[PDB]
Amino acid sequence: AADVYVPDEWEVAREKITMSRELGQGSFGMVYEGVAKGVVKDEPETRVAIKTVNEAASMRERIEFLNEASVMKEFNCHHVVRLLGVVSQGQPTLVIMELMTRGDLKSYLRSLRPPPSLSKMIQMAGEIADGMAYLNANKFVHRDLAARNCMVAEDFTVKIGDFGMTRDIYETDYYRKGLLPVRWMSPESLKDGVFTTYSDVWSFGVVLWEIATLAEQPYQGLSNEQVLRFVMEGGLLDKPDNCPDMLFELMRMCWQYNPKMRPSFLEIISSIKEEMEPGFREVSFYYSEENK
Ligand SMILES: N#Cc1ccc2[nH]cc(CCCCN3CCC(NC(=O)c4cccc5c(C#N)c[nH]c45)CC3)c2c1
């Protein structure tokens, strides 16, 4: 399982993939926009994102890259970016993904700085929580939930997804005392380095705070070590200027010191479902037959 990737029904002929332009450096190599033939039912061609493994990468790194794709083969959720294919024969190694035309949510929020309505903010919150509920139900703990690791579609739908954020402009969101997203981590994760569904919920509260501040750096002014201490000693982020009270109260629930006191993602959605737009009932994990 380690050491080898076996090409399968996800393998795409490299001749069916064309790359048009760069999207940015991912954690294993450059990511491109392009077009893939035959990857979506009833579409002769589909616009896609294309992750690559850099030429200088090691044998082991190629496998890690491929195992990350392998884990997503199981998933099919409206609120999680979809795997579409793999090219593991010859070079370069490629992974083909659903294209999110408006990019990552951190960048998007920052672009709005010289404001999104409460209804808009709630829609984003529910979409993110729904994708996370789906993943957690399928025994997937994310470990790096953050606005930079959510993506925005042409119609503004937010989905869980990323190309690896440790090596580009948000590299300073990680601390290497392995790389740890310390400003997004629960007190218990900061202490013992274990991640759980409960710590994903902590991180979700930070994502709400990002939405409410147009992606300020959490704990701005504190160094990484000062953040570790602050959070482990029971400190919290301040209520953002002009923040709707209902959003801050949700943050506070996510930031219970005791992980067992926090809501689950399903409980979070239950608390805001009345404010979700028409359509959510039809596409969500929460309302689906799978949620049981
Ligand atoms: N290919 C592909 C592909 C296709 C469709 C997709 N839709 C959504 C995603 C991204 C899902 C999130 C995956 N990421 C979650 C954090 C993981 N982090 C680690 O695996 C990890 C590795 C080493 C040390 C630590 C650590 C510590 N200390 C905490 N996490 C890690 C990296 C992958 C996605 C990816």
Ligand SMILES: N#Cc1ccc2[nH]cc(CCCCN3CCC(NC(=O)c4cccc5c(C#N)c[nH]c45)CC3)c2c1
């Ligand atoms: N920062 C920021 C920011 C900036 C601009 C934004 N505009 C909208 C949002 C909120 C995110 C929610 C996006 N939503 C837009 C309508 C979509 N709904 C539909 O697309 C739809 C809903 C119901 C039936 C059908 C249908 C049928 N049959 C075809 N489409 C639909 C669902 C996602 C938003 C957030």
